[PDB]
């Protein structure tokens, strides 16, 4: 039993809720919140800009030190950093950004990072400003992630389409 509330159960391990991941993060204090990161961990907009704003820019400060030490992530890769006031940990995962021409097949590799964590609050990778089809992203998620994933979908309209079209 865990503290996630109001989710629709899609599969044995995937749940989905129309929710603001920031607000859901502040209420649940999940062990892991996933950020829709880029390789530079520049949290300027979309989910990343919202999560970082909610941390009063502490996420960005920590991220800049991480990059200065380690260099950029790979597309499809991830790193674990602090969750600040939102979660114990933030798993920064880089899905491909279609608006940069990145290979959508790397989306499966991106979701594989989730399997290193028993339970996660997460957005749909490569959705929103990353330019992929959220329905495809949901399919890859369900077919790749084996751990327990609670997907927060900000847009109510999108959410209802994802539910209604789910196979
Ligand atoms: O842009 C957001 N979400 C999308 C996104 C963004 C970046 C990468 C992604 O893979 C996705 C999936 C989309 C979604 O889940 O709706 C988002 C969320 C909460 C917010 N609060 C204030 N502004 C917010 C913006």
UniProtKB/Swiss-Prot annotation:
It catalyses: Thiol-dependent hydrolysis of ester, thioester, amide, peptide and isopeptide bonds formed by the C-terminal Gly of ubiquitin (a 76-residue protein attached to proteins as an intracellular targeting signal). Residues 1-167 form the Macro domain. Inhibited in vitro by GRL-0617. It is found in: Host endoplasmic reticulum membrane. It is a multi-pass membrane protein. Responsible for the cleavages located at the N-terminus of the replicase polyprotein. Participates together with nsp4 in the assembly of virally-induced cytoplasmic double-membrane vesicles necessary for viral replication. Antagonizes innate immune induction of type I interferon by blocking the phosphorylation, dimerization and subsequent nuclear translocation of host IRF3. Also prevents host NF-kappa-B signaling. In addition, PL-PRO possesses a deubiquitinating/deISGylating activity and processes both 'Lys-48'- and 'Lys-63'-linked polyubiquitin chains from cellular substrates. May form homohexamers. Interacts with N protein. This is Papain-like protease nsp3. The lineage of its organism: Viruses, Riboviria, Orthornavirae, Pisuviricota, Pisoniviricetes. The gene is rep. The chain holds residues 1025 to 1191 of 7096 of the full protein.
């Amino acid at each position: 039993v865990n503290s996630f509330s109001g989710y629709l159960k899609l599969t044995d391990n995937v749940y989905i809720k129309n929710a603001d991941i920031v607000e859901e993060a502040k209420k649940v204090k999940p062990t892991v919140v996933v950020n829709a990161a880029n390789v530079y961990l520049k949290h300027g907009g979309g989910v990343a800009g919202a999560l970082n704003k909610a941390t009063n820019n502490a996420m960005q400060v920590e991220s800049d030190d991480y990059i200065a030490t380690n260099g950029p992530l790979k597309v499809g890769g991830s790193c674990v950093l602090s969750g600040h006031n939102l979660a114990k940990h933030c798993l920064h995962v880089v899905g491909p950004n279609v608006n940069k021409g990145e290979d959508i097949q790397l989306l499966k590799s991106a979701y594989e990072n989730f399997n290193q964590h028993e339970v996660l609050l997460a957005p749909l990778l490569s959705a929103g400003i990353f330019g992929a089809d959220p329905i495809h992203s949901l399919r890859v998620c369900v077919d790749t992630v084996r751990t327990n994933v609670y997907l927060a979908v900000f847009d109510k309209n999108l959410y209802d389409k994802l539910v209604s079209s789910f196979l």
